[PDB]
């Protein structure tokens, strides 16, 4: 009924590892358009959203939409059991109690079959409406991740501030404070390393360091990361894919002082 | 600012700090117009480290008035790690400061990383501890001293240095046995860096704790030759020469039981 063959299993393994620490049980709503998933974390400070597109898969077809509830730990274990060079295929029937994973290698000699039991997860419906954010920024993921790793060593909270041609990451702690200031920069020879900034209103927000540490694990998916910030919304972290994206909506810390 | 000192590359300062990090915890830097001196004393008060960095180690240097910066070495090393070995590192301080600014800036991009480390109220004099006329002064390559120390430390917790006319003797006596290395002065005009130099007025015989010497030899990464100055009544001086200044260890000898 439903079958989805990836060009390479490494892509799927990386996507799964991206958000497996934030959430463990999740429903994938496979549709003719593609796979769309949305999960809330246990503490409800984080929403993860996935919109893998049809173009991402090497081949894909699912006539009737089907929801597959699965635990990410077992899927990660099965993917680890698989080889680096493989064309992972997910197979499911009209009313599947399990999903079949086929690791078809380039050489026909190597063929592997696995079965993963599905689950019945009571997942509600979430309406994520687009919002006019106060600021948008885009920058390489290695840089952002290095900033987060360095600043988390100084404090439990990291403050992101955006003002006119200035992006500021700050962390204050017992031994002192650390700050990184980036400016909008464009490199024609190497566009992938450019820093882009759209600024409508000044923004300042604070986030738990552990959450940003969890989020930066998605850097592998996309060489660039987009961050959208508003005074009243959660902060949106987007890693683009070939046709989909991995999305993190993070609530900020409660501002006790103000 | 009042104090601005720019290292071309942060790696220089990181290696200098790593040269004595393991022996002490709290360090007091005094910055003056002629450069930066620093002192620290180990927890047991048996070892003292004295660092000197001249203005030539810096691409640019400016210190309008003398200033004292006390800090914990673990926090400083943690911060130094957060910056890249290639970036330019500027130490900045203001008059009567509550913190020291470490500014990592790379010219390739417009990325500035500014760290501020809160300073301690460490009020302690340096005393410029250095006896005028040491009994014996010797110098030898750092690798050989490291090897002798490492070999003899496997045998005993204490190492004795005996200097007599034209002979330097290291000795260690322990549970499984004893070891004794004897070296003699020698000048090799083909390879002066391998030379062993010995000048001496009074013969000397002093015992030292092995763990302290094992810490001291970590300075070998900063210099190819080590100088050793010994006297009957003074701490032993182990000096490693830098391109601009120096790193000194003053180690007190064991009491003659």
């Amino acid at each position: 009924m439903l079958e989805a063959k990836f060009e390479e299993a490494s892509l799927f393994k990386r996507i799964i590892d991206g958000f497996k620490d934030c959430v463990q049980l999740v429903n994938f709503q496979c549709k003719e358009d593609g796979i769309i998933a949305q999960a809330v974390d246990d503490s409800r400070v984080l929403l993860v959203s996935l919109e893998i597109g049809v173009e991402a898969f090497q081949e894909y077809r699912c006539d009737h939409p089907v929801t597959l509830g699965m635990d990410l730990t077992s899927l990660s274990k099965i993917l680890r059991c698989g080889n680096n060079t493989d064309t992972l295929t997910l197979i499911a029937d009209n009313t599947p109690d399990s999903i079949i994973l086929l690791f078809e290698d380039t050489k026909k000699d190597r063929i592997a079959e696995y079965s993963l039991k599905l689950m019945d997860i009571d997942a509600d419906f979430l309406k994520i409406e687009e919002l006019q954010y106060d600021s948008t920024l885009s920058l390489p993921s290695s840089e952002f991740s290095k900033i987060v790793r360095d600043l988390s060593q100084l404090s439990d909270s990291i403050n992101i501030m955006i003002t006119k041609e200035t992006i500021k990451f700050v962390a204050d702690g017992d031994i002192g404070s650390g700050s990184v200031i980036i400016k909008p920069f464009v490199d024609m020879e190497h566009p992938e390393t450019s820093i882009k900034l759209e600024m409508d209103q000044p923004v300042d927000l604070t986030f738990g360091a552990k959450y940003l540490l969890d989020i930066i694990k998605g850097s592998s998916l996309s060489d660039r990361v987009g961050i959208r910030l508003s005074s009243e919304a959660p902060a949106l972290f987007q890693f683009d894919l070939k046709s989909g994206f991995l999305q993190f909506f993070l609530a900020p810390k409660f501002n006790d002082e103000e | 600012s009042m104090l601005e000192a720019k290292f071309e590359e942060a790696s220089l300062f990181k290696r200098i700090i790593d040269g004595f990090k393991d022996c002490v915890q709290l360090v007091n830097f005094q910055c003056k117009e002629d450069g930066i001196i620093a002192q620290a004393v180990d927890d047991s008060r048996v070892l003292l480290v004295s660092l000197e960095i001249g203005v030539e180690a810096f691409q640019e240097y400016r210190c309008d008035h003398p200033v004292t910066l006390g800090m914990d070495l673990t926090s400083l090393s943690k911060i130094l790690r957060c910056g890249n070995n290639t970036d330019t590192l500027t130490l900045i301080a203001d008059n009567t400061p509550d913190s020291i600014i470490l500014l990592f800036e790379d010219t390739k991009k417009d990325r500035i990383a500014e760290y501020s480390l809160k300073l301690m109220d460490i009020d302690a004099d340096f005393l410029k501890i250095e006896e005028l006329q040491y009994d014996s002064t010797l110098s030898l390559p750092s690798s050989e001293f490291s090897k002798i120390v490492r070999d003899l430390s496997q045998l005993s917790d204490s190492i004795n240095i005996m200097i007599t006319k034209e002979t330097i003797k290291f000795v260690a006596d322990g549970d499984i046995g004893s070891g004794s290395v004897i070296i003699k002065p020698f000048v090799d005009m083909e390879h002066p860096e391998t030379s062993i130099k010995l000048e001496m007025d009074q013969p000397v015989d002093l015992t030292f704790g092995a763990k302290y010497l094992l810490d001291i030899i970590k300075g070998s990464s900063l210099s190819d030759r080590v100088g050793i100055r010994l006297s009957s009544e003074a701490p032993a001086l182990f000096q490693f020469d830098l391109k601009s200044g120096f790193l000194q260890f003053f180690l007190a000898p064991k009491f003659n039981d």
Binding site: - | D72, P97, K118, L119, M120, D121
Partner: protein
């Protein structure tokens, strides 16, 4: 405004808003000029103004901008073992004081030290307290400590010796009615004469409880939507006070002295959920101020009530303790 419970909404903002602790607030206010604040030990019963006082003092000393860099607050919600005291607290006490800005120096006294607030210090182990002793003395030049507690005997003698003691007095109708009336007027609460003083009598020295009771009564009145005054009977109902008729029934059962009758009445009484401590308090008031009982009876009952109150303070079964007390009174 409309989002704060009244206890937090009306927390004193400055030292002049603390109402009945002048004997200590005066000393503290003098240090805005003398700038030689000693190590402090605030102690006293619940809801008397200790935390409010230390917070207001720090604000007055450093201004809103410089406060954060000059304060280390650690309370019972934080980990405060001996390792914490030996590393985090010691390290903060060692530091140079944050530099004040020019504006800060113009508008605030800015003394040359920082403050470590150990709120609820009576929950710290004796060994961690011991570890504080020499840190307090060696770094007095740049750091001052403020320990806050309800039970002063839980602080080890060396630390109590090092600290300057400030006892916070119980707040009653005599010395807190002005503040309670101010709050009542700000919130437009209509009350009969006697009601605010009755609130403070019920609160038994705790102004936080009195304010919360006033807020509950005003919520009731607003919900009723009739514009009438809050009465004392309503306040007593909100405060879990036993109605005088029920107490008289208890007293008559005790007078009769029949064990089975007392037992059955107590069993029925417990079903109403009356707090045993309030019942014992009301019985104490009834008997000790009764001209119909003689000296020997009152001596014996005073000891009985003391014993039962002590046993209840340990978390015991209220039914058992109350029945035992009533039987013992009946056999006097």
């Amino acid at each position: 405004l409309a989002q704060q419970p009244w206890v937090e909404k009306y927390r004193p903002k400055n030292l002049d808003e603390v109402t009945a602790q002048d004997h200590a607030v005066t000393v503290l206010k003098k240090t805005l000029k003398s700038a030689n604040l000693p190590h402090m030990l605030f102690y006293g019963p619940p809801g008397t103004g200790k935390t409010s006082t230390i917070l207001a003092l720090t604000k007055e000393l450093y201004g809103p901008d410089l406060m954060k860099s000059r304060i280390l607050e650690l309370n019972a919600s934080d980990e405060r073992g001996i390792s914490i005291v030996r590393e985090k607290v010691k390290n903060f006490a060692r530091l140079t004081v944050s530099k004040p800005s020019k504006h800060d120096l113009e508008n605030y006294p800015c003394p040359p030290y920082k403050i470590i607030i150990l709120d609820e210090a009576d929950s710290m182990t004796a060994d961690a307290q011991s570890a504080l002793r020499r840190t307090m003395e060696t770094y007095s030049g740049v750091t001052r400590f403020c320990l806050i507690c309800n039970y002063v005997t839980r602080i080890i003698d060396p630390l109590a010796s090092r600290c300057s003691k400030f006892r916070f007095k119980a707040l009653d109708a005599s010395n807190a009615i002005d503040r309670l009336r101010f709050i009542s007027e700000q919130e437009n609460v209509k009350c009969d004469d006697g009601v605010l003083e009755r609130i403070l009598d019920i609160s038994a020295g705790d102004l936080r409880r009195g304010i919360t009771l006033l807020q509950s009564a005003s919520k009731g009145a607003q919900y009723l939507g009739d514009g009438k005054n809050i009465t004392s009977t309503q306040v007593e109902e909100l405060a879990g006070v036993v109605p005088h008729d029920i107490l008289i029934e208890i007293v008559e059962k005790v007078k009769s002295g029949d064990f089975d009758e007392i037992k059955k009445y107590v069993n029925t009484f417990m079903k109403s959920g009356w707090s045993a401590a309030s019942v014992v308090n009301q019985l104490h008031e009834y008997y000790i101020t009764n001209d119909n009982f003689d000296t020997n009876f009152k001596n014996q009952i005073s000891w009985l009530l003391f014993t039962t109150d002590s046993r209840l303070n340990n978390g015991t079964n209220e039914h058992i303790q109350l029945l035992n007390l009533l039987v013992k009174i009946s056999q006097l």
